């Protein structure tokens, strides 16, 4: 930035660009070659796209050119860490984790059920045979 008689001083990246905002011309006054100045300028003027704090849910933002990348905590995904993996317990998402049949219930939790010959375990998702030869299992291999 410019102030009275500062331009008498040779240019300084630290003084003029790091400690203050510099204009393109102040930058060129430091680098001199047009190509060196544009290489500096491309990032210097790009802006920190992470300054809007786009990464939600405890995630971490890394600035790029005109863009950013969000690194999420393990329970989140999405461009901005917006999707909660914990809110995804519906039958189309990996059968709702049910071993056999899954039933959606809107508002409340999906429930899991079993084929005839099996019964649902304590854990609300696993099935156990109630008969000696339940369907769909191969006795000589079990």
């Amino acid at each position: 930035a410019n102030a009275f008689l500062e331009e008498l001083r040779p240019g300084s990246l630290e003084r003029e660009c790091k400690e203050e905002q510099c204009s393109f011309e102040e930058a060129r006054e430091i680098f001199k070659d047009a190509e060196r100045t544009k290489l500096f300028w491309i990032s210097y003027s790009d802006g920190d796209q992470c300054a809007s704090s786009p990464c939600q849910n405890g995630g971490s933002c890394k600035d790029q050119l005109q863009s950013y990348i969000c690194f999420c905590l393990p329970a989140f995904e999405g461009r901005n860490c917006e999707t909660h993996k914990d809110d995804q317990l519906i039958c189309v998402n990996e059968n709702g984790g049910c071993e056999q049949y899954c039933s959606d219930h809107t508002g409340t939790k999906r429930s899991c059920r079993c084929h005839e010959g099996y019964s649902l375990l304590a854990d609300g998702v696993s099935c156990t045979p109630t008969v000696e030869y339940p369907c769909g299992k191969i006795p000589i291999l079990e």
Partner: protein
């Protein structure tokens, strides 16, 4: 309903988002992804977005080749209409992110320049891996200074005329690629 189209993979440092057209009107989308012999896994269930983050699936093996498809469902609901994406192989196609110079130092007659580890979305042992953890000897860094130096590590050791101030910029490169071979240049740092 209409099938999605212009399915495109957007991926930098393994963060990998599928994008498509068009904006829905009385239809919603679900995405599936698979490997050629694996089962299809659903993601972004009934979204009205026209993007779907697939990073968590592809980082399970970045050298596999993945196929996605986007289903269109009539609002409120045979096989649905759908469109397949291009195949995507993350290790071969992910963009290399913009690097950063971590430090430089005058060790007498020479200057060491160190490139910050570039974090990626691949996790191992509960932590994020760097580009060098994932790529190993496939990844080099290149340094432009004022001409060029190249390294198999994250550090450069270059000769400098003493008392002179130099400026530096670096680029991540996978020399075996022909497309997306290099990152953008780092911000410039100067002595």
């Amino acid at each position: 309903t209409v099938a999605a189209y212009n399915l495109t993979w957007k991926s930098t440092n393994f963060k990998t988002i599928l994008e498509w057209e068009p904006k829905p009107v009385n239809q919603v989308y679900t995405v599936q992804i698979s490997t050629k012999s694996g089962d299809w896994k659903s993601k972004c269930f009934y979204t009205t977005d026209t993007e779907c983050d697939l990073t968590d699936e592809i980082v399970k093996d970045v050298k596999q080749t993945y196929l996605a498809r986007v289903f269109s469902y009539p609002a409120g609901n045979g096989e649905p209409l759908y469109e397949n994406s291009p195949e995507f192989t993350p290790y071969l196609e992910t963009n290399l992110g913009q690097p950063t110079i971590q430090s430089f130092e005058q060790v007498g007659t020479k200057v060491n320049v160190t490139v910050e580890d570039e974090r990626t979305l691949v996790r191992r042992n509960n932590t994020f891996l760097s580009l060098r953890d994932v790529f190993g000897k496939d990844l080099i860094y290149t340094l432009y200074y004022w001409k060029t130096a190249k390294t198999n590590t994250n550090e450069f050791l270059i000769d400098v005329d003493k008392g002179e101030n130099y400026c530096f910029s670096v680029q991540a490169v996978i020399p075996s690629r022909t497309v997306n071979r290099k990152s953008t240049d780092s911000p410039v740092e100067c002595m």
